[PDB]
Each structure stands twice: as C-alpha cells, then as structure tokens.
Amino acid sequence: TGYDLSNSVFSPDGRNFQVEYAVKAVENGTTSIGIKCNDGVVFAVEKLITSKLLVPQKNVKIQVVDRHIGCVYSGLIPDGRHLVNRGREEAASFKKLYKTPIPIPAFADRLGQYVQAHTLYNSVRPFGVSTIFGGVDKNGAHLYMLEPSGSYWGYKGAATGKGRQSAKAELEKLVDHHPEGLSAREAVKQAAKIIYLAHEDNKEKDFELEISWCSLSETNGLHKFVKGDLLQEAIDFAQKEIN
Amino acid sequence: TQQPIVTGTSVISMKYDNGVIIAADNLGSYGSLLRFNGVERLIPVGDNTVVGISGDISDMQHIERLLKDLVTENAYDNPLADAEEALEPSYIFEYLATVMYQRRSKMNPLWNAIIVAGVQSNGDQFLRYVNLLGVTYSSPTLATGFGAHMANPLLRKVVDRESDIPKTTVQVAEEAIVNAMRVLYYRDARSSRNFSLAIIDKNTGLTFKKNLQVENMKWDFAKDIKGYGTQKI
C-alpha cells in the first residue's frame, strides 16, 4: 500500500499513480480542442463565465509561443502558464542558436521532455494540464497533444476537458467526412461548433468561445486570434448548427 | 567588443512638423577596405520606430536580434500588442540605453552609436541618441560620427530650435537629409553613394526607401585643377 503517495514511484503494475491523479485534475477542467486544416491549425477553448462580473473578451486563455505556435491547455491553468513559459524559453534558445524559428515537432519534444522530467523525482509534482499546441513550419501544419505523463502525439484533431468525449466523436466525424482536408475558415467554424456541442456538460453555466488559428494562407504562417467579424460568424454558425 | 572590426559610418536624422527622418549609407567597412555594400543599418521596429546604428557591425546585428526578441516578448500574453500596448519608440530607446550603459559599466561595450527615431502614440516626435558609453542626449537634429561634424551644421540651419519644427515640412527635411548625405559622400572617406532613408510620419506611418543614390554631384571644376601651386599644364 501507499504506492500513490510519492511521485516517480512505480506501483507493482508499473504505474505512476500521481500522474493519473494529475490526469484526473486535467479531466476536471474545461474543454479545449485543436483541428489541423489543409495549411494550418485551429485552436478553440470554452471559458466558463462563473459570474457576469467577469469582463468579457478579457481573461484570455490561449497563449502564443514564438510567432507561429499556439498553445491551449485543460486543467490547472497556472501549470499551463508555467509550461508555456518554459516552451517560450526553449523556442527563444533554439532560434538564438539556429536562426530559424523552432519547428513544431522540435517544440513538441521540448515540452514533452520537460513534462517527462517532471515525473522522474518525488521532489516535484506532475503537470495538472493536457496541452494542445502546434502551428506552421517549413514542413507544413502540425497539431500535437501532450499528457501529464510526458506522452504526446500528433493529431488530425485533439480534445481535452470535461467534454473531451463528444469533441472526439465530432472530430472523428469531421475526419471521416473530409478526407481532402478542411480549409482554415471551415476549420474555425467546425471548432466553434464542437465547442458549443461539448459545452452541454457545463450546461448550467454560460460559456465564452475563444478561437485562434495559424494558417499559411489565411494568417501567413503566424498565430492570430480569431476576433471581430470572423468570430461572430463562427458563433452564429454554431448557434444555428445546434438546431 | 574591445575594438571594432566591420564598421558603419554616420547616421543622420532630424525632426519635422509631422514626424522624423533618419538616413544612413549601406556600407560596412573593414578598416580602410570598403568591404560590404548593401548593408542595411536602419532597423525598423513596429510601425513607429526606426533605429539607426553605426559602429561595429556584429554588435549591430546583435542589437537587431535583441529588438526582434523584444517585439516577440511584447507580443506574449498581450491582446493589445497591435494597439495600446504596442512598442513605443521611448520604450525601445530606454531598453537599448540601459543595455549600452550596462555593457559600458561591465567594461565590455557594444561598439556603437545609435539614434532611435519615431512617433509616439500621442503623435509626439521622438529622436534620441545613445552610444557605447551610455551617453544620451536629444536635439531637433542628431548625427553620429562625421555626420555630427557636417550633417548637423547643415540640418541645424533648417531647425535651429524647437520653434522651427512646426514650420518645417517633410519635403524640406528630406531635401536637407539627402543634401547632407551627398556632403558626407563628398568628404567622408568611409562612406558610400548608396543609402537608405526612413520617414516616420504621424499620419502616413513608416516610409522606408532603400537603394537610394547620391545624385546631382558637382565635379566639373576638377578639370581646372592643375598641380599644387606653380604647375600650369
């Protein structure tokens, strides 16, 4: 007994229970998704309005890394900010040494090695976030998801949070229906729809939709937040699509 | 840097009624060898700042990388990085000046002279200088190196005090800048005929002109110069 009391300890099955408890902490968080399109990626997140005292459009959740990487996370938000700070340091170091901006797989492995190192000792706690990130590099679009265990993979679509299951279902539908790939604007619309759909698990509280994207043609390979007319168009698409 | 290697010469600049102008030649010298041409010594930052740098070229490229990372950092977690919380010319100056004085005090200077020029968010004209010693000063006209000796006397005959700034049009100021560039090409032995010129106007934004050339030079009288005194043929 007592195998779950200390991080980096192996249970007789070969498990690290503290990582699984961090995963529970992640599953407690709001829903965030990413969708890989034909020439970029789209990130979307639901933000619960606990009270109307919250300032709308403020309290931004999606973070930018370098000028081409977008990161969103579900779980303990300060842990996600810590991970994003480390990733920004890693990208800055890579650019300073090699001149070119850090490729998306390289940045993915940087984040992954960091999170994995956070499971090697009992003097540190695993990250209480799952992180969807990615962007456009010299090899095209890349979308990645990273788990508290340090595990990470590349995805056509990814989702975490309390509504991760319906999101994954809708993403599998989108993948099966579009073997050619989605365009950036269509991907923004579908992300809005999937966020509105997965919100039903938090139906008792209002939510605010936050979208960003990095498209080779629509954003010129740079990370930009979807705001203004395009955001309202995606909101209306989702609204008339839930009916 | 303990001694400069690849160097760039004067950087000139002045204020006018609606903004600032700054210019510098496209030459990187290697001692008395005019080694590299097409060297851009004007670093535009944002839509409202241009940094003219003279001195050690490697240190200038280091400052380029510094400004690039500064823009990237200001973008982070800043939903107003393109509006109210965008980088101001005064911010960029104060940062560069802090760096210059810290490097001088650590006895390892960035062998440079720098003029930051731009328009503030409220429309004010910003034009300030900082060199490898950490020395800072501001004036309606600002020049480094030989420019300080030759460009300033000309440019000051247009804007002698602050009161002349509203009276000065952008055409007059640009004409003065180009004439000063021609004079420097006449008399500076480490200068180039090709140069770049940037206007920061509080209405038209940043205008960047590359591959300019010194024109309308007077050279005919050279034919009438025989010997060095008594020679007649």
What is the compact description of this entry?
This is part of a larger assembly, with chains A (243 residues) and B (233 residues). Chain A is an alpha+beta fold.
Question: What's the Cα radius of gyration of chain A?
Answer: 18 Å
Helix residue percentage of chain A: 25-40%
CATH architecture descriptor text of chain A = 4-Layer Sandwich
What is the number of independent domains of chain B? 1
Shape of chain A: globular
Instruction: Please bin the fraction of helical residues of chain B.
Output: 25-40%
* CATH-derived architecture of chain B: 4-Layer Sandwich
Strand fraction band of chain A?
A: 15-25%
CATH domain topology of chain B: Glutamine Phosphoribosylpyrophosphate, subunit 1, domain 1
CATH superfamily of chain A: Aminohydrolase, N-terminal nucleophile (Ntn) domain
CATH homology-level superfamily of chain B? Aminohydrolase, N-terminal nucleophile (Ntn) domain
| Helix/strand order of chain B | EEEEEEEHHEEEEHHEE
How far is the N terminus from the C terminus of chain B? 51 Å
What quaternary form is this? part of a larger assembly
Specify the biggest β-sheet of chain B.
Answer: 8 strands, antiparallel
Strand content of chain B: 25-35%
Number of strand segments of chain A: 10
CATH class type of chain B: Alpha Beta
CATH topology of chain A, by name, is Glutamine Phosphoribosylpyrophosphate, subunit 1, domain 1
Number of helices of chain B: 4
N/C terminus separation of chain A: 51 Å
